[PDB]
Design an enzyme around this catalytic site. Structure first.
Site, PDB file in Angstrom:
ATOM      1  CG  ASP A   1      61.451 -58.068   2.970  1.00 15.35           C
ATOM      2  OD1 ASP A   1      62.518 -57.973   3.621  1.00 15.35           O
ATOM      3  OD2 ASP A   1      60.449 -58.671   3.403  1.00 15.35           O
TER       4      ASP A   1
ATOM      5  NE  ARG B   1      64.985 -61.494   8.708  1.00 17.05           N
ATOM      6  CZ  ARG B   1      63.794 -62.032   8.455  1.00 17.05           C
ATOM      7  NH1 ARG B   1      62.992 -61.502   7.529  1.00 17.05           N
ATOM      8  NH2 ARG B   1      63.424 -63.131   9.101  1.00 17.05           N
TER       9      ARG B   1
ATOM     10  CG  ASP C   1      54.817 -59.780   2.562  1.00 14.90           C
ATOM     11  OD1 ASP C   1      55.764 -59.727   3.377  1.00 14.90           O
ATOM     12  OD2 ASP C   1      54.990 -60.061   1.358  1.00 14.90           O
TER      13      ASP C   1
ATOM     14  CG  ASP D   1      57.482 -56.306   3.051  1.00 14.63           C
ATOM     15  OD1 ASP D   1      57.934 -56.549   4.187  1.00 14.63           O
ATOM     16  OD2 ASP D   1      57.319 -57.177   2.179  1.00 14.63           O
TER      17      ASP D   1
ATOM     18  CD  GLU E   1      57.191 -58.827   6.773  1.00  8.32           C
ATOM     19  OE1 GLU E   1      58.094 -58.659   5.929  1.00  8.32           O
ATOM     20  OE2 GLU E   1      57.238 -59.731   7.622  1.00  8.32           O
TER      21      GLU E   1
HETATM   22 CA   LIG Z   1      58.057 -58.927   3.493  1.00 11.53          CA
END
Ligand SMILES: [Ca+2]
Length: 352
Positions: free
Chosen positions: A170, A218, A129, A131, A166
């Site tokens: 998000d 995304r 993760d 990010d 990542e």
């Molecule tokens: Ca993420």
């Protein structure tokens, strides 16, 4: 004031009583926030003790350049990031011109956070993760004027063949109001979620004046809620753009799409398709697809593409004030307003 040009209404740390501090490293940012929780008697205050305006002056170009030169070595490393947990007093993290970070900013159960002028890229820890910016259970967050980048590429042998890197931004949980504006996002495979799962639906997010280039998917992957995407420049989208899912509604207005596969779609669930209101983009009818190199593909499960380029639903009256410039002006001028070192400049009709 608290005008972000979108759903989030916050001034961050720029409020009365704000304490200005200079962070020269990732660790400084961590220590500064920690100290900001202490009152005059050294006792902790829930939510923070005083508002903050942190000016990051650090530079991690060496880490970024080394990572760029060996991208497949990033996913397995430890992730690096500053966590803004339960800090509701108002905080603004602004990078000084020339600053850079090889670490992300993870906001959690906080509110009134502004992240500006940060150049973040090639973060390690894609498999854990890593990010660049994460907004979790955090309303009134404004991610503005940043450059978030990596390499739009997947190394083989990575967990789930999706963890080379990542995301850029998000958003999940109860991050009810968020504005993502004037960012230059490039070389990123999974740009950003808007709901972490089928059940994590809702939120009202505005994406405006972002310049996307060489991104796979995304933009965002929306799960329910409302998304207002205006004045964005989307070029070289190699997978899919706005994926409206779990009955989400999107107002896609005055954007410039170009060289994009599935720029507006609803796929991967096979049901509960979201809707879109198309208005004023450079694309006005299917005949423009060939003009701007828009391509469409099908999916293994039931999906809905905007191949007819017609609105498929409705959108509530937008809660805030905003004045979009034309799609053409976006295409011509946006690259000079989006990103770092633009002195947080905004695109107005005047400059068109
Ligand atoms: Ca993420």
């Amino acid at each position: 004031a608290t005008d972000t040009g979108g759903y989030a209404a916050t001034a961050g740390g720029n409020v009365t009583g704000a304490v200005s501090k200079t962070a020269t490293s990732m660790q400084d940012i961590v220590n500064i926030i920690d100290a900001a929780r202490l009152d005059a008697n050294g006792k902790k205050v829930k939510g923070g003790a005083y508002p903050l305006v942190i000016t990051y002056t650090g530079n991690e170009d060496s880490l970024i350049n080394a990572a760029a030169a060996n991208i497949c070595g990033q996913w397995s490393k430890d992730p690096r990031g500053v966590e803004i947990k339960e800090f509701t007093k108002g905080i603004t993290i602004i990078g000084a011109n020339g600053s850079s970070a090889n670490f992300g900013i993870w906001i959690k159960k906080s509110s009134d956070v502004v992240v500006q002028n940060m150049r973040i890229g090639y973060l390690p820890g894609g498999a854990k993760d890593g990010d660049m910016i994460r907004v979790d259970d955090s309303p009134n967050v404004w991610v503005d004027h940043n450059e978030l980048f990596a390499a739009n590429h997947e190394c083989d042998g990575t967990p789930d063949n999706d963890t080379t890197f990542e995301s850029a931004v998000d958003i999940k949980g109860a991050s009810n109001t968020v504005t993502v504006s004037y960012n230059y996002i490039h070389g990123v495979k999974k740009v950003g979620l808007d709901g972490s799962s089928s059940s994590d639906t809702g939120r009202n997010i505005t994406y405006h004046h972002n310049y996307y280039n060489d991104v796979n998917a995304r933009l965002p992957l929306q799960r329910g809620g409302l998304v207002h995407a205006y004045n964005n420049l989307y070029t070289n989208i190699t997978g899919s753009g706005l994926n409206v899912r779990q009955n989400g509604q999107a107002l896609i207005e005055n954007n410039w799409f170009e060289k994009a596969i599935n720029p507006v779609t609803s796929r991967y669930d096979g049901k509960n398709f979201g809707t879109w209101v198309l208005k004023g983009n450079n694309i006005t009818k299917p005949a423009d697809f060939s003009t701007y190199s828009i391509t469409w593909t099908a999916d293994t499960k039931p999906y809905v593409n905007a191949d007819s380029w017609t609105s498929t639903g409705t959108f509530p009256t937008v809660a805030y004030n905003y004045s979009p410039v034309s799609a053409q002006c976006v295409k011509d001028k946006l690259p000079g307003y989006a990103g770092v070192g633009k002195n947080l400049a905004t695109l107005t009709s005047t400059a068109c």
